[PDB]
Write a protein that binds this ligand. Structure first.
Ligand SMILES: OC[C@H]1O[C@H](O[C@H]2[C@H](O)[C@@H](O)[C@@H](O)O[C@@H]2CO)[C@H](O)[C@@H](O)[C@@H]1O
Length: 461
């Protein structure tokens, strides 16, 4: 009898290629039509290509321009050269042949089927982090498996993820501080994390608590993040221990064509430590001081991450407020820098919010088990976290094995100092609305629109 046998089905990276081949146990000359049909999980049969005895070739609009149906009557084989592959292609590919009998009737013949998988691992992490290093981990993953690991860093990913991941595909794995994850968990945008005891035991038990919402693990903890006072040792050997002595220092420095302190005033995460130093009466005190700095022309009105960073690295400002991630760019520059305790306000310390960098798996992802493999066996390893850390520092890693190395770093000590003086952010769904309320409040008071008393009024509502 006549039997069709398909081959060439495997795993590939989008943009890659695959040659399917279907050999018959009889001459193709006898066939009228030969063609390729595909079936994806839970869907109807979809013709992709066909070739008639008359040498005419037809294709479906999705594959048109990308796929070519070929035939070799010597080898008694029909081919499907699939170029520039996409995730929509992923399906079981079947070979079909039609034969007119001697009489009026015809015969349809089918094959076993050949599986084609187009898989890409996509990761969303912020641009201020070590995406290049995260890619080096992803490159080792592809060597040991065959899956592509692209690393993306889009603007406003914290508020682009819940919109795109809900409707569209978005990323497989999302990287952000633990505070944003409760809102994703409530909305149903994250898969429940199920790590075995042995993996679980590799990380500090306090770190796991930050990535827990209603008794379910919603992410993998990576590292603890806290803002510190970054200062130029040459321009300022004995930096301010108090916030209230910065105006004096600024007067001194402005005479020599230099600023005292430049940091991101737009993002409320950077201004919150000063606001929360005393506490309400504490928020009113802390903000009024911040307002007086802009009013006394000590700080610029629209001071953002880029002009603050650049100014410090250039050697224009004596101080800056930033996280572990910012250190590598300073090292690149020729600035003898120091990382230390944040200045105190009204005697009491400035309480910076503490973030736990965490990796979560998107609920609407087909690569949930592949991402778990990447996160556990490749990223959350000594070797894996090292790679990320040499690009842009992670801070105080969640890995137990890294304690000695963390403790040997003076900047980590300063980070941990500030983290103890601060507090970990609750993961709750209301954090988004809270942060927005503070973001507006600080900008309005900074520019000169709303009063300090009226800012806390609108923010408490
Ligand atoms: O600015 C408010 C913003 O702050 C925090 O985001 C930090 C993030 O945690 C850090 O890793 C760093 O990259 O900067 C961000 C602020 O610029 C909160 O995690 C976030 O929810 C909040 O929107």
């Amino acid at each position: 009898q006549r039997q069709l046998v398909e081959s060439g089905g495997g795993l590939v990276q989008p943009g890659g290629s695959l040659r399917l081949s279907c050999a018959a146990s009889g001459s193709i000359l006898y066939f009228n039509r030969m063609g390729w049909y595909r079936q994806a999980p839970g869907k109807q049969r979809e013709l992709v290509a066909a070739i008639t005895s008359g040498d005419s070739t037809n294709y479906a609009d999705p594959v048109k321009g990308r796929f070519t149906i070929s035939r070799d009557n010597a080898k008694n084989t029909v081919y499907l050269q699939m170029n520039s592959l996409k995730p929509e292609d992923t399906a079981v590919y079947y070979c079909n042949a039609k034969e007119k009998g001697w009489s009026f009737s015809l015969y349809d013949y089918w094959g076993q089927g050949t599986p084609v998988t187009v898989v890409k691992l996509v990761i969303w992490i912020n641009g201020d982090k070590g995406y290049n290093g995260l890619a080096e981990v992803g490159k080792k993953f592809e060597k040991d498996t065959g899956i592509k690991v692209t690393v993306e860093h889009p603007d406003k990913l914290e508020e682009k993820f819940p919109q795109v991941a809900a409707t569209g595909d978005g990323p497989d794995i999302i990287f952000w501080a633990h505070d944003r994850f409760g809102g994703y968990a409530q909305s149903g945008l994250l898969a429940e994390i199920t790590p075995d005891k042995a993996f679980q035991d590799k990380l500090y038990p306090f770190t796991w608590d930050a990535v827990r919402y209603n008794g379910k693990l919603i992410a993998y903890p990576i590292a603890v993040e806290a803002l510190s006072l970054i200062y130029n040792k040459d321009l300022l050997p004995n930096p301010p221990k108090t916030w209230e002595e910065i105006p004096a220092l600024d007067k001194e420095l402005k005479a020599k064509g230099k600023s005292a302190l430049m940091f991101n005033l737009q993002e409320p995460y950077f201004t919150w430590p000063l606001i929360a130093a005393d506490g309400n009466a504490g928020a009113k005190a802390g903000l009024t001081f911040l307002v007086d700095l802009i009013k006394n022309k000590h700080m610029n009105a629209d001071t953002d991450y880029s002009i603050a960073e650049a100014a410090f690295n250039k050697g224009e400002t004596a101080m800056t407020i930033n996280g572990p991630w910012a250190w590598s760019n300073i090292d690149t520059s020729k600035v003898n820098y120091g990382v230390t305790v944040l200045p105190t306000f009204k005697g009491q310390p400035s309480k910076p919010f503490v973030g736990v960098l965490s990796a979560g798996i998107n609920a609407a992802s087909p690569n949930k088990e592949l991402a778990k493999e990447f996160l556990e066996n490749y990223l959350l390893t000594d070797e894996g976290l090292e790679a990320v850390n040499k690009d842009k520092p992670l801070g105080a890693v969640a890995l137990k094995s890294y304690e000695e190395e963390l403790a040997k770093d003076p900047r980590i000590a300063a980070t941990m100092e500030n983290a103890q003086k601060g507090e970990i952010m609750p993961n709750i769904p209301q954090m988004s609305a809270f942060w927005y309320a503070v973001r507006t409040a600080v900008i309005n008071a900074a520019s000169g629109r709303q009063t300090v008393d009226e800012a806390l009024k609108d923010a408490q509502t």
